[PDB]
Design a protein around this ligand. Structure first.
Ligand SMILES: NC[C@H]1O[C@H](O[C@H]2[C@H](O)[C@@H](O[C@H]3O[C@H](CO)[C@@H](O)[C@H](N)[C@H]3O)[C@H](N)C[C@@H]2N)[C@H](O)[C@@H](O)[C@@H]1O
Ligand SMILES: O=C1c2ccccc2-c2n[nH]c3cccc1c23
Length: 253
């Protein structure tokens, strides 16, 4: 029973997400901050997808703990503990001189996730799977041509779709990925990167799935920081074709 919510103050958080209602639970005497995600209709499946991934990935990485999860035919409710601290973005903005330490911490953390042996992963998040989702979102008109990257702004959804297809085929690579390795999804506390959130897309895919999203986020701070991500991670010459493909695929989500 969800009655383990008494004494909490409620707030509704718009973190620019897709679908799910996120409630922040705070102000309870000597009780931790909690988050409650609610998905209605098809969004119940997205909240269900996150719950399994949190449940599985917690044996390997630092993530929010599942306190309670409820599923009924149209609704999914996900109650978790919060990861204390600030997003990597908020940290980067407040302390520009910590850029290099943050990027290094992000690359080390991403290497840890990518190092989890694939033989442990029950989720498929590969290009073929994601291209199908991208296609259903384009054909349902759910893709927002407003939130596109600068090099693609003003482009109709179908231009991105056709141009992205010219970058294929590409070399086979498979590691355990986050799916949305952005500056808003990595949590910092007292200089250290303490965990990640928004694990709904976790599964086996190409490492550029995570590398491309973070690299792009770093583009709004410095090209030297974007360069250091690949240098700390350990890639000599970043695959720009793979980088562009993953950046274009993220436009449909
Ligand atoms: N639609 C919902 C999704 O919205 C964001 O993802 C979007 C990015 O924001 C866009 O990129 C822009 O914002 C980045 C900072 O995040 C900037 O670095 C970049 N220069 C900008 O062009 C990108 N083109 C599309 C991508 N789907 C959230 O991260 C994600 O959780 C959420 O699911
Ligand atoms: O949305 C969440 C969130 C959602 C579910 C679980 C934990 C978190 C979480 N932990 N720390 C932060 C900082 C900003 C946003 C969020 C967090």
């Amino acid at each position: 029973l969800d009655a383990d919510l008494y004494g909490y103050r409620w707030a509704r958080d718009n973190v620019g997400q897709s679908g799910a209602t996120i409630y922040r639970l705070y102000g309870k005497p000597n009780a931790p901050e909690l988050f409650l995600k609610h998905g209605k209709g098809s969004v119940a499946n997205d909240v269900t997808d996150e719950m399994v991934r949190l449940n599985w990935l917690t044996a390997f990485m630092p993530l929010p703990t599942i306190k309670h999860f409820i599923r009924t035919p149209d609704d999914a409710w996900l109650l978790t503990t919060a990861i204390p601290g600030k997003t990597a973005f908020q940290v980067l903005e407040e302390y520009p001189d910590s850029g290099e330490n943050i990027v290094d911490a992000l690359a080390v953390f991403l290497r840890r996730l990518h190092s989890i042996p694939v033989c442990n992963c029950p989720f498929n998040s590969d290009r073929v799977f994601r291209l199908a989702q991208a296609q259903s979102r384009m054909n349902n008109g759910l893709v927002d041509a407003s939130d596109f990257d600068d090099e693609r702004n003003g482009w109709p959804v179908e231009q991105v779709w056709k141009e992205m297809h010219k970058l294929l085929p590409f070399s086979p690579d498979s590691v355990v990925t986050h799916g949305d390795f952005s500056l808003d999804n990595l949590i910092f506390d007292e200089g250290k990167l303490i965990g990640c959130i928004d694990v709904g897309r976790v599964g086996i895919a190409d490492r550029y799935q995570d590398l491309a999203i973070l690299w792009n986020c770093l583009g709004e701070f410095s090209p030297s920081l974007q360069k250091r991500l690949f240098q700390k991670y350990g890639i000599d010459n970043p695959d720009m074709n793979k980088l562009q493909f993953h950046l274009m695929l993220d436009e449909f989500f």
